[PDB]
């Protein structure tokens, strides 16, 4: 789902 991509980006940027 394209609508989940920025959530994944946020998680990456955090972890990291």
């Amino acid at each position, epitope marked *: 789902n*394209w609508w989940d991509i920025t*959530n994944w980006l946020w998680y990456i940027k955090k972890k990291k």
Partner: antibody, heavy 122, light 109 residues
Framework: QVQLVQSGAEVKRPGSSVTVSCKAS????????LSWVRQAPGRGLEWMGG????????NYAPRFQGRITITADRSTSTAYLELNSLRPEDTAVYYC???????????????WGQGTLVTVSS | EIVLTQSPGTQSLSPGERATLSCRAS???????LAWYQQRPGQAPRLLIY???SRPSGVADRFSGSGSGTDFTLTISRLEPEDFAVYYC?????????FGQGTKVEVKR
């Protein structure tokens, strides 16, 4: 606070192409999804497409795929909608909208531009 | 494409009344990615509910969302004068996001 400001009203001839801009301030332009939604007579709200600037990836609604380009300029935090081969049924108010956050993005559109009236007419 | 049906498309209600608005999807909406917006004439839409039941801070707690799968409801516990407006549901559980046709809540007199 996030604010989206759009360019002003346009009159466009049938068959031409229109570009509408949406300048963002506040929050992170690059990592949150920006969409375009229009409001045409008799048709409620209709989602047209969106872009995630950092990835330069777009997602277009099939009804507009082939007629639309959405771009984002990270240097100015401005997103653009191009719509081509204009017809009278494309007369509408065009809004840009950015997803909200809790921060963590929410997908749904919390932040809206003021709208741009595009009139397609001879 | 997921088609969202908002029926009835108009409800005539009295100030102070409870309102329940239906949004029914033609197939299941993934992860309950269902939002509700309010729109008044001459204004941009405003987010009320996301994720079927989550409410942004700033949105009045008289608005609540519920439901799952294909059957979603926006409840307004007590209509204030500013609540007479058009309400749209939107699904974003597939890459192709779609909106319902809206329900106008109008003042019964």
């Amino acid at each position: 606070q996030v604010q989206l400001v759009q360019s002003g009203a346009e009159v466009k001839r049938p068959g031409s192409s229109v570009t509408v801009s949406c300048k963002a301030s506040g929050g992170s332009f690059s990592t949150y999804a920006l969409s375009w939604v229009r409001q045409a007579p008799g048709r409620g709200l209709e989602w047209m497409g969106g872009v995630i600037p950092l990835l330069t990836i777009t997602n277009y609604a099939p009804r507009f795929q082939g007629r639309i380009t959405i771009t984002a300029d990270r240097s100015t935090s401005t997103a653009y909608l191009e719509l081509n081969s204009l017809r009278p049924e494309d007369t509408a108010v065009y809004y840009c909208a950015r997803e909200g956050t809790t921060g963590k993005p929410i997908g749904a559109f919390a932040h809206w531009g003021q709208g741009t009236l595009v009139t397609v007419s001879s | 494409e997921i088609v969202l049906t908002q029926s009835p498309g108009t409800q005539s209600l009295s100030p102070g009344e409870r309102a329940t608005l239906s949004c029914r999807a033609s197939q299941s909406v993934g992860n309950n990615k269902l939002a509700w917006y309010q729109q008044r004439p001459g204004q941009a839409p405003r987010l009320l509910i996301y994720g079927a039941s989550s409410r942004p801070s700033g949105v009045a707690d008289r608005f609540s969302g519920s439901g799952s799968g294909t059957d979603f409801t926006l409840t307004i516990s007590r209509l204030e004068p500013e609540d007479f407006a058009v309400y749209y549901c939107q699904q974003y559980g597939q890459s192709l996001s779609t909106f319902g046709q809206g329900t106008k809540v109008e003042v019964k007199r």
